[PDB]
Amino acid sequence: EEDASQLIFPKEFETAETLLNSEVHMLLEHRKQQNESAEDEQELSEVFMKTLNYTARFSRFKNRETIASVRSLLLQKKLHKFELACLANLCPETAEESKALIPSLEGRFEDEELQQILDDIQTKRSFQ
Amino acid sequence: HGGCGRYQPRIRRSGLELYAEWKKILLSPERVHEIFKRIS
Amino acid sequence: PDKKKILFFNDKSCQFSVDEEFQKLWRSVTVDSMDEEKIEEYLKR
Amino acid sequence: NNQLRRNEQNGAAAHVIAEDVKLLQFHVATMVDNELPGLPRAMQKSGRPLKSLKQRLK
Amino acid sequence: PAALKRLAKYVIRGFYGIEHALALDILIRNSCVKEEDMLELLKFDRKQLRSVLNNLKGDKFIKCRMRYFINYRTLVNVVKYKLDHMRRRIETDERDSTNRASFKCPVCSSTFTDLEANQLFDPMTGTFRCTFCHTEVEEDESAMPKKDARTLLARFNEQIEPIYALLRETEDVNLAYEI
Amino acid sequence: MFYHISLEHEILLHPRYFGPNLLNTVKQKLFTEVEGTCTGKYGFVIAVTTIDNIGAGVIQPGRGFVLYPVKYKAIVFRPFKGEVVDAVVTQVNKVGLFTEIGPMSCFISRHSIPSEMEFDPNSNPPCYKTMDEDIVIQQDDEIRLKIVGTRVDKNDIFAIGSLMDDYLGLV
Ligand SMILES: [Zn+2]
Numbered sequence: 001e002e003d004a005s006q007l008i009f010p011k012e013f014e015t016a017e018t019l020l021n022s023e024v025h026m027l028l029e030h031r032k033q034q035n036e037s038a039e040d041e042q043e044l045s046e047v048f049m050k051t052l053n054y055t056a057r058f059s060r061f062k063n064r065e066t067i068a069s070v071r072s073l074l075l076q077k078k079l080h081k082f083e084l085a086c087l088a089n090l091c092p093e094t095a096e097e098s099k100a101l102i103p104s105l106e107g108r109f110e111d112e113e114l115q116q117i118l119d120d121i122q123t124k125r126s127f128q
Numbered sequence: 129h130g131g132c133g134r135y136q137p138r139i140r141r142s143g144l145e146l147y148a149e150w151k152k153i154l155l156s157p158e159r160v161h162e163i164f165k166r167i168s
Numbered sequence: 169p170d171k172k173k174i175l176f177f178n179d180k181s182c183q184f185s186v187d188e189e190f191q192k193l194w195r196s197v198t199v200d201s202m203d204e205e206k207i208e209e210y211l212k213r
Numbered sequence: 214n215n216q217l218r219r220n221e222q223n224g225a226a227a228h229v230i231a232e233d234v235k236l237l238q239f240h241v242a243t244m245v246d247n248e249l250p251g252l253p254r255a256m257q258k259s260g261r262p263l264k265s266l267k268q269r270l271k
Numbered sequence: 272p273a274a275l276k277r278l279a280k281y282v283i284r285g286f287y288g289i290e291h292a293l294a295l296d297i298l299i300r301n302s303c304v305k306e307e308d309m310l311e312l313l314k315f316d317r318k319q320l321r322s323v324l325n326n327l328k329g330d331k332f333i334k335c336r337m338r339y340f341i342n343y344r345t346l347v348n349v350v351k352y353k354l355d356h357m358r359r360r361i362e363t364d365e366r367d368s369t370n371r372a373s374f375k376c377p378v379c380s381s382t383f384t385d386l387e388a389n390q391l392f393d394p395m396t397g398t399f400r401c402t403f404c405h406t407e408v409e410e411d412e413s414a415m416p417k418k419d420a421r422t423l424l425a426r427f428n429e430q431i432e433p434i435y436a437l438l439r440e441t442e443d444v445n446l447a448y449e450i
Numbered sequence: 451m452f453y454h455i456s457l458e459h460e461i462l463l464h465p466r467y468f469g470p471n472l473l474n475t476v477k478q479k480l481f482t483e484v485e486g487t488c489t490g491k492y493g494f495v496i497a498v499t500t501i502d503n504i505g506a507g508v509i510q511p512g513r514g515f516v517l518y519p520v521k522y523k524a525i526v527f528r529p530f531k532g533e534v535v536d537a538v539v540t541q542v543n544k545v546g547l548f549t550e551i552g553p554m555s556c557f558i559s560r561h562s563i564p565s566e567m568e569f570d571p572n573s574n575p576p577c578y579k580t581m582d583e584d585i586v587i588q589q590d591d592e593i594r595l596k597i598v599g600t601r602v603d604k605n606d607i608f609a610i611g612s613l614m615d616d617y618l619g620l621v
Contacts, residue, residue, distance in 0.1 A: 002600075004451075005532025012492075016453035019525070024452055024496075027525075031497055041478075045486030051496060051527075051552040058536060058592060058621075085451055090534060090594070092617055100616035101534050101596075143251055144238050153200075162201050169316040177293060183284030184434040188427070192357040193286075194221060196349070199329050205348060208355040226322055227329070386601065389557055389608070397543050 005103045007082070018081065020088040021055045022067055028052045060089050062126055073120060091125065092118055274445040275345070281438030282350065290315075294323050298333065304343045350442065357428075365424050367417040374408030376401035383408060451530065456502075456523045457492065459484055462515045463507070476504060476518060485524070490602035493528025494553065529554065529609055533597040536621045537611070539589050542576035544569050547613070549593060554607045558595060562612035585620060594621045 002008055009016075028051075035044065061067050074084045083105070092098045095115035099106045105114065137148035139155065146155045186192075198204065217233055243255050247265040254262045276299055283295045297309055310320055324343075327333050333343035374388030375381065381401060383391070388399035388408050399408040432439065459480070467475050480501065488494040505519035529535070529551070537549035537556055547558040560569065567578040567587060577588035587593060595611035595618060613619065 002530065003532045004530035004597075009530070012455070013453065016451075016455050019452045019454060021452075024525070027497065027499070047486050047488065047494075047496065047553045054538065054550075054552050082451070086534065089536065091621070094617070097617035103532065144235065144242060156200070158198075159201055166203075169319065173314045173316060175293060175314045179296070181284075182434075184431050186285070186431055188357060188361060188424075189286060189353070190224075191360070192353050193224060195360060196353055196356055197221075204352060208351045211355045211359070227326060228322065385559075386608070390606075392543075394541055 004082075007104060009082075018085040020067075020085055021058065021060050022062075024051075025056055025059060026064075028056070060091065061124075066124060070121075070124065073117070087114075087118075087121075091121065093122060094118070272445070272449065274441050274448065278350070278438050278442040278445060279345070281435070281441065285435060285438065291323060291326070294320075294327070298327075298343060298345070301344050304341070306341045361424050361428050364417070365421040367421050368415075371411055371414075373411050374399045374401070375410060375412050375414070376404065376406050377409045378406040379404055382411070382414070451533070452525060452527050453493075454523065454525050455492075456521070458519065458521045460517050460519050462517055465514045465516070468516075473504065476520065477501065480520060480522070484522075488553070488605045488607065490604065490607075493526045493602075494607060496525055496527060498522050498524040527552065529597060529600055529607070531597055531600050534594065534615075535597065535611075536592060536594045539587065539591045539593060542569075542578065542587075542589055544571060544576075547578060547587070547593075549595060549611065551609070554609060556595065556597075556609045556611055558611045558613060562598070562614050564614055567613070587620060592621050594618050 002010075028048075031048070032052075035041070061070065070088070071084075083102075086102065087098060090098070090101055092101060095111040095118065098114050098118060099111070135150050137150045137153065139146055139148040141147070147153070148155055214237070217230075217237065220233070221230060239252070242249075242252070243263060243265070245265055246267045247254055247263050248268065256262055279295075279299070283292045287295055294309070294313060294315075297304065297313065306324075310317060313320060315323075324333075327343070328335065330349070331346035334346060336342035336344070373385060374383040374391070376383070379401065383399075383401070388401075391400050391402060391408075392398075393400045393405075396407075400406070401408055461476055461479055463476070463479075481498065485495050485498055500523045502521040502523070505521075507516040507518040509516050535551055537551045539547060540550045541548040544560070546560045547563060549556045549558060563578060566580050567585070568581065570577045570579055570586075573586075573588070575588045577586050579586035593613070595613060596615045597609045598612050599610045601608040
């Protein structure tokens, strides 16, 4: 019954500000930077590095200002903020894919619009 | 408001059953239950 | 009445017997209750 | 319950159903409260009337 | 309403039994039907005739016209009433869940979902192991054959329409004739 | 969806901790049994960063303990049905493809994998590949999948996905 395809969130997710794999990745070392100082503390948990070893092997962007801009990129757009985080961790390249990835954005804008942001993404993403 | 014109019986009660004559109909639990099922 | 009053009588040209009808005869026991005819039309709408 | 289920599972004469629906009404009005006037009391042992639920918290 | 007595010819055939049907045959003529005449004619029992009449009264099949001497006339518009409710109950028993192929352990006859045995799924054996006993799981087995019931009901409940087509059609065409 | 939400909790202190450094002792005891132990109703608690305020410690009658309510902001992950995600394959089997997203487990049934990528048990690493072998998805491969359904039990989360949808496969 609880599906994000039909966009059913619990009413507790009104102030649920989100983030993607890189901002998670940023503070994950700061928690490791917390384990550097504040001695006389025991070992870490298991899920802490289990997620850290996972989402550090793959990233969505490269550095701070790469995201500090992409959040200002979607800033002026008429968006649900749930929309930004879904494709921020998708990296699509064709507009109908993105609308095949989203059961909800067929009927919002022109197809090339999100493709242009997809172009804006693939223009800022430094592939190697 | 509500629309109807019929009468209501004088519902008696006997032991474990209840009668009603305006035609003495002994009421059923399913009947009065469906009656109750519609009160707003 | 067991073996008392009798009417030998003849009529036939084929018919159907429904097992689900036997359940339905017993799943439609409402008798007096009213407000059912309108419900049938609402379920077909 | 089990004997009425099969008896109106096959379409009985619609007259044994009155005198057994009164039996069910009596039996279920026997468990909760027995000290209601009328309603001839039920018994199992040596003249022991039933100790109904409302009778259990006197 | 000669073809209204034809839907009637087909329901008596289709439903009510000889004892009922013989009485229902008399109901054919809606001119005059007394209680003494119907008793003497049917050669039935009086208590039993009263039971059938009471049963027909339950159908609201007849409008008891008092003098006291009686008269009896058709009320059933419940041909749809049997239909809408029976179709609902059969579609409930028909509409199944899903493949619902939960693992089931044949030794302890315990029931699992595809999800239940997934946590159990044992990577060293490439198959699903039951919880408290490592015996391999099986199909939901018998459990609920609601899928076989769906198929059966569909053949059986919709297979009685052809033999009812004569009346389903007469009623429809007769109702149109009645206006 | 990684969310940054605010929730609260209460801590029972044993009377041997009172005295100086009482307040910080509530802090260390907060980190342990709140993070790294994920629940089912709110999602996955990964890490906390700020603790807003500590209420007043109500001494309950008898049994010594004093309860202090606390308010904190913790980043939480809670995936939803219909969500599309990149995952890593952990095990390949004939019934399907096992992938894993962070601490969460994920099952991809074979019927929900395009027929072009047929299962290959013949390869020493079990895998999924095109007949032309244009791609060979196996263990520890990075793929994108669509959540068909999600689960939350005691502390472990699972989801189920499909590769049949467009724009899916290796990433
Ligand atoms: Zn077992």
